[PDB]
Design a protein around this ligand. Structure first.
Ligand SMILES: CC(=O)C(=O)N[C@@H]1/C=C(C)/C=C/[C@@H](O)C/C=C(C)/C=C/[C@@H](O)C[C@H]2OC(=O)[C@]1(C)C(=O)[C@@H]2C
Ligand SMILES: [K+]
Ligand SMILES: [K+]
Ligand SMILES: [K+]
Ligand SMILES: [Mg+2]
Ligand SMILES: [Mg+2]
Ligand SMILES: [Mg+2]
Ligand SMILES: [Mg+2]
Ligand SMILES: [Mg+2]
Ligand SMILES: [Mg+2]
Ligand SMILES: [Mg+2]
Ligand SMILES: [Mg+2]
Ligand SMILES: [Mg+2]
Ligand SMILES: [Mg+2]
Ligand SMILES: [Mg+2]
Ligand SMILES: [Mg+2]
Ligand SMILES: [Mg+2]
Ligand SMILES: [Mg+2]
Ligand SMILES: [Mg+2]
Ligand SMILES: [Mg+2]
Ligand SMILES: [Mg+2]
Ligand SMILES: [Mg+2]
Ligand SMILES: [Mg+2]
Ligand SMILES: [Mg+2]
Ligand SMILES: [Mg+2]
Ligand SMILES: [Mg+2]
Ligand SMILES: [Mg+2]
Ligand SMILES: [Mg+2]
Ligand SMILES: [Mg+2]
Ligand SMILES: [Mg+2]
Ligand code: NA
Ligand code: NA
Ligand code: NA
Ligand code: NA
Lengths: 59, 74, 53, 92
RNA sequence: UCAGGGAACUGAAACAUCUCAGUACCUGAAGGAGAAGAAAGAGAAUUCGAUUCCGUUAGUAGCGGCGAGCGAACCCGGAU
RNA sequence: GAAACGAUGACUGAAUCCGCGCGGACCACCGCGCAAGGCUAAAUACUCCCAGUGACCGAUAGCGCAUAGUACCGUGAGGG
RNA sequence: UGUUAUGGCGUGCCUAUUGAAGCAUGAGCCGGCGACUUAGACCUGACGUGCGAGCUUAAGUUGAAAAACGGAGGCGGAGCGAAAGCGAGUCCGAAUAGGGCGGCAUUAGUACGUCGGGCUAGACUCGAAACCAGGUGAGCUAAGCAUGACCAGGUUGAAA
RNA sequence: AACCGAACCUGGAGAUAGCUAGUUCUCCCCGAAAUGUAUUGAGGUACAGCCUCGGAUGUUGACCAUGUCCUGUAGAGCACUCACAAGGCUAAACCUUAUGAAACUCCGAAGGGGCACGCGUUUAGUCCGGGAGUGAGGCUGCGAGAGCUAACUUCCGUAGCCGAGAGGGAAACAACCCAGACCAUCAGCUAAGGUCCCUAAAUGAUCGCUCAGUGGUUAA
RNA sequence: GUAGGGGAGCGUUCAGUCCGCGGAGAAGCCAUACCGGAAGGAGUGGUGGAGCCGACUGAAGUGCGGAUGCCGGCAUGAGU
RNA sequence: GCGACUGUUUACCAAAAUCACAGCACUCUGCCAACACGAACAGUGGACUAUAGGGUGUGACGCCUGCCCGGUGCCGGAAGGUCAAGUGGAGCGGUGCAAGCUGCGAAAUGAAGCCCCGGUGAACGGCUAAGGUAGCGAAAUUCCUUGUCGGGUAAGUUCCGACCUGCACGAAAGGCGUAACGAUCUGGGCGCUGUCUCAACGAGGGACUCGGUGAAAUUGAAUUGGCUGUAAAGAUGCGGCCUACCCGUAGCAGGACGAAAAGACCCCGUGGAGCUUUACUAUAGUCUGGCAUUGGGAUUCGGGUCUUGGAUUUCUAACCUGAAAAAUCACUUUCGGGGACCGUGCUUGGCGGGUAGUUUGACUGGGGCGGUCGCCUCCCAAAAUGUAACGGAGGCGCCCAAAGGUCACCUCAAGACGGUUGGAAAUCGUCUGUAGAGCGCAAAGGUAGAAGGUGGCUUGACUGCGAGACUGACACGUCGAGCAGGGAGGAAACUCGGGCUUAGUGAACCGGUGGUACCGUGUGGAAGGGCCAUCGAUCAACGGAUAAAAGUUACCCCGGGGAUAACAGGCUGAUCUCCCCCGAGAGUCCAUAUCGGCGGGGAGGUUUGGCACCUC
RNA sequence: ACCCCCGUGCCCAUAGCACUGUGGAACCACCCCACCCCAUGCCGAACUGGGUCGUGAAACACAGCAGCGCCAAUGAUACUCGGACCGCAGGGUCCCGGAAAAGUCGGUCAGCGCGGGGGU
């Protein structure tokens, strides 16, 4: 899907998922301190395969 | 009633003799069972942790007050 | 985190010049009017900071 | 779309403006007797792309005096060519 | 081949959009082919310069209960 | 959707030379082009028919048929 | 070798299952027919091969008892970020904490062929109640309309 | 127009089918699983565990010993909570005596687990990458709940075995006991179990028991 | 040792190439006590009356016990 | 008993109590009628017209037909409240030197409806808007029930007549009664009868035999015994034992869980179809406003500077329709009437199961009903962690400007003794007191050097980050030293990035607000888009499907399942049945001639069940 | 070197409570005053500022005392790792190791440091 090219799986030099954090951003929040300020990166070594098979070609 | 339940966890994570690192979590608990010794800090949830490198050390003074220290190698 | 007419509310944060939110759970239960404080926004800091919407 | 695919907090914004051609500095320096880069003879220097402009980036280091006529160039590139001899020409 | 009219199963691990698909079917008209065609264009170079087909662009831009999934054009080569 | 433009049913209804349309609401600038008339080889598609060819079958294959839309079935379309 | 007498031993096959000789499923027999393929310069991997920091062409043209020409284009080559952009560095950031990338003591690819597998098509084969379009049917049957035909004989005995 | 809670024929159409069945030649090697989590998920799928193949790493694997640390089950105990027997005292508390506890703990094993190392024997693990199957097991011993301390019962933990496991034994009889099939052989020794006869093997030896056919279906 | 993964090969048709066989006679069928670790192959005989083995390589419309499979032929229920 | 009757209907298992029926009632319809067929203001059917036609209900006849309209439906009234397009245009915003060229967008006004008032019940419907008038009544309504009594019979659960406690009788979904009617239903009686105790004889066509002709279902292979046990728990192929020469014919149907139909019950499948409604959604249809076809003459009301509009009224060349002469029309004409309406086209809103496309969860010792899904605390949990049940208990979906940060200071529950509105506790005082209290809520752990209680000062309930670890398949979640820009409390070391911790919450998509300026398709802006923050979530089927949704099927279909129920068998033996032990006591005296309080120990596999073992 | 006191640790009940005795100006405490710095939501009780006498009573220190607490064997037993069995069952046994609790004997009301002060 084209909603994948704009999904947090960028084709990095190596070939893994360039994730982020889905804890809480837009709604349902207001507690904790810097829980929302967790707008960093994320990575996984068990789904890189069944995710890159949809965006690999159009890197 | 059958309804209701909870996975829970807790326990000990770094046992005595082990070589910790700056940030390793030592023991998880609810209250203050294991008090922060020398070389060992304490989180909101009484979760013990290590400040630097070293070795895990248990100390018991007849129950009641538990202590965990870290003896550096070097 | 329900949201109805019930007492207490989620509050926006303003500032003297500063344009920053703190997000705080207040309550109209007791003293409910002086929602002013001091939260330095990215800036020089020390800015008069009232969450009072 | 119910397995990780969806549920990822990403909106971003697609633009895709201008992608410049990475011309490594060792390609000019090191080997070669200076064939004069210009904008036509350089095609034989293994930088055939077309449709896009040209960019000059410093990576190889061997001081040498060579003239460079690329479309655009970096801060460190220009301060590495004229530092050993040459002149980085940019379009008016 | 063009034109008029115009489904559903199916998919969406259900189903009202969308897909299927403007497909099947129906009807009208013509030929050894039609359609299309001589710019109130394409497009960004103050450029190419009828139309159609092939390759490429490219599965890109974009579209989509932003889901399934659908999906150009210009530049250029070539038939003519 | 910020949604242009083309098209169309129903209501309205401009100019034309210091003119008109367009260039993804809009405006200025800039740039391209000038409708409301028509016709027009070739490249393209398909194939009843013909020739040739085959790492195509050799008849429980191959078209359905080594001839037959015949025997046979149904009121019929049709099946075969 | 063929056949037999006798002793010992010995719970059809397949499927589906925790478990089959199953008193579970399938099968009269035999011959024949019959089930993991094909396509997309698709994606990915193993192997092999010809180039090698380069690697090939598609359409097509001219020739075909044979093949070359054709470099529009694609993959190598620099990454990082939402993007501008910057660049061996960039994004968060008001400069130092980290993530991603080079440099790591060190690692090049691409084209084609075969093959594993994925994607998209009916995708191992056979099979349902159903939905939709077009068309054929009232010579069976349920009715209407028009026009013809048929109901031995006997009994009871209304109005007027 | 012989079978209508929506006719027939043709076409879309080889509709879909988490369904059922079937799925064809050969040997060699390894070798599963029916668990966790998620699911309009429960007889289906994703991921993980578990399998195989290649490369790299190349002993970090395994068992065991030693040392160290941690966890409150069995048991027990009455010191907290609840319950509870007799008596004294003057209902409660207190005292003497005596108790019971998954949700009591003054105490507290075996065992287990993590880590370090190897004093020792063996052998594998991990990482990357291609392809999988399996996500409906059953019983027995032991430790629990549920059930009438019933069920070839259900639901968990754990060991073995069945599952994909032939052979011998238990009359027959996956699950039990003993044992893991490379093949060939008119060879030998053994295990579990037996050695009168029908099947191979001492109608064996010594000292007792039961007059019963107990063995060869149970209790107050 | 099942699902499964891996390895080495047999057989069939078509094709290129090579050595050939065939009227004193191929393929096919039929009998068999030989050979190879399996898939299989060979010798001889009988039948038959025109074409077809082996080796290497390539390409699939490639290997049957089953699907209440399909087609054809022939049985049992019975001389009922 | 029912239905009045004649009649009629499920071709092919229901001819009946169904339907129809004359009769009655409500209600619509002014005639291009209402209504209906239809792509079509065509055409036709109603139909060549108000005791005529359509629809509905009841279903001859006789006596009759109550109470309640809250709601729903409908009719009528209708001040007001709300409501679409449109009319109208202030304000706001963008671009340009400007003229100007363009987005967003009101107050008011604006149709049918809805809300609101009343009425209508042979309207749905009830017997909170009121509650059973007549009649009937255990009647086809009957549960407990075979009710009670009476009649018939030697004996009656049904039948008839009454009573009454009418589980749920009831006056047009009509109540009650009724002559006649009936291949209808029920009971009794007479007659007769091989219907029966009970079979017998006789016959005729077939079975039997011979000659001729010659099938079908089925079929893994067969050399195919009985008893017991075992095996998936129903044995001819297993074991043991017993019996049993080989091979037919005529016959009986116990077995081969016999043959036919992949089960029509049941469950499953995010299978199908038909049918319902106040499930969702749309549409035929229909009502309505505006705008065309669509004009003329006046009055009032609006206003600007000749008119532009709304309404009322009236006339007529459009249009519609009728008659006469050449029935359908085209034609010209006398005219007749309606006539700016209607019709029709576009558009707006409402109504809408007539029609259409679909949804309607799962777990579950079958399913349904009930109950229950997330998170938190103990127990189960078998001394790491983890570990299930429809196992045993109890909570949460918040709260707090302070219960926060920090800085200082205080120490509890309870008992005893003595004291005043007390007289139990409590207020006060003094001792004892490892705290047997407290910590906002559930529970555990933990706390006396406090995470118990107070006071001063403050807004660290900060921002930019985070080595390294715990935990999960993933996604999430959890702890955290240190560093930086700035602050808070204390003299200070130092601590603080919410509250003793563990629940007080939820992905993505979409959108709102502030901020900042990255993009912005010729350029420069702008719309918009991104980013930072943050808001909207009983999405509680709480890893969540759609922006948007309920039932029925005995008229049912299909794909499956002994993977899942009801029959049976099997396992078990709560229950059921029986036996046995002890013995108080009854039995005049006396435990045991008989009987056996309380309570115990077994057997059987005939009850109701459990489980779901082989057969769907 | 002897001893004592004071302050502060390790140790954190085998070093604790109770009872009793000893200590008087080196040390400690009470005590005295306290309008102000400071402070008890009331009290200078406790904090606190300035300091004689008196006393050691209380507190504290030390010593005896161990009635009570605490600590706690040996032996045996419960249970269990391993192996091997029995009953229809609830259960239970043998072999080999490890090994409680409680109770009893008994044990002890500490010991070990640093600094400062005053005495012989
Ligand atoms: C009550 C019951 O007891 C009952 O409803 N029993 C079921 C059989 C029925 C209803 C049969 C009805 C007859 O109209 C046809 C008879 C049938 C089809 C008999 C089928 C039989 O051979 C198999 C089973 O069928 C069942 O499903 C059934 C569960 C059953 O007990 C049978 C053993
Ligand atoms: K031969
Ligand atoms: K005969
Ligand atoms: K049975
Ligand atoms: Mg999902
Ligand atoms: Mg076609
Ligand atoms: Mg066998
Ligand atoms: Mg059989
Ligand atoms: Mg069978
Ligand atoms: Mg079956
Ligand atoms: Mg007559
Ligand atoms: Mg018919
Ligand atoms: Mg099919
Ligand atoms: Mg093998
Ligand atoms: Mg399972
Ligand atoms: Mg299990
Ligand atoms: Mg299996
Ligand atoms: Mg006969
Ligand atoms: Mg009588
Ligand atoms: Mg009749
Ligand atoms: Mg006779
Ligand atoms: Mg037998
Ligand atoms: Mg018979
Ligand atoms: Mg079935
Ligand atoms: Mg079925
Ligand atoms: Mg445990
Ligand atoms: Mg979505
Ligand atoms: Mg029917
Ligand atoms: Mg089964
Ligand atoms: Mg049963
Ligand atoms: Na045609
Ligand atoms: Na189709
Ligand atoms: Na006879
Ligand atoms: Na419907």
């Amino acid at each position: 899907t084209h909603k994948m090219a704009k999904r947090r799986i960028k084709i990095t030099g190596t070939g893994k998922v360039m994730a982020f954090k889905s804890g809480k951003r837009h709604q349902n929040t207001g507690k904790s301190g810097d829980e929302i300020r967790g707008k960093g990166k994320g990575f996984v070594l068990a789904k890189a395969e069944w995710a890159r098979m949809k965006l690999m070609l159009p890197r | 009633n059958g309804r209701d339940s909870n996975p829970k966890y807790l326990g000990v994570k770094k046992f005595g003799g082990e070589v910790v690192k700056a940030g390793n979590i030592l023991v998880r608990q609810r209250g203050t069972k294991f008090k922060a010794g020398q070389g060992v800090g304490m989180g909101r949830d009484h979760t013990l942790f290590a400040l630097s490198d070293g070795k895990v050390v248990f100390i018991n003074k007849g129950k009641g007050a538990r202590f965990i220290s870290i003896e550096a190698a070097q | 985190a329900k949201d109805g007419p019930r007492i207490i509310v989620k509050m926006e944060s303003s500032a003297g010049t500063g344009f920053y939110y703190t997000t705080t759970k207040n309550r109209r239960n007791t003293q409910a009017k002086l929602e002013l404080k001091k939260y330095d926004p990215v800036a020089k800091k020390h800015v008069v900071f009232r969450e009072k919407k | 779309r119910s397995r990780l695919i969806a549920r990822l907090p990403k909106r971003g914004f697609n633009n895709v403006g201008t992608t410049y051609e990475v011309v490594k500095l060792s390609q000019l320096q090191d080997l070669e007797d200076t064939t004069f880069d210009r904008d036509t003879l350089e095609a034989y220097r293994l930088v055939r792309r077309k449709n896009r402009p040209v960019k000059l980036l410093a990576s190889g280091e061997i001081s040498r005096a060579v003239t460079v006529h690329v479309d655009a160039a970096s801060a460190a590139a220009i301060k590495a060519v004229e530092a050993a001899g040459g002149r980085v020409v940019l379009p008016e």
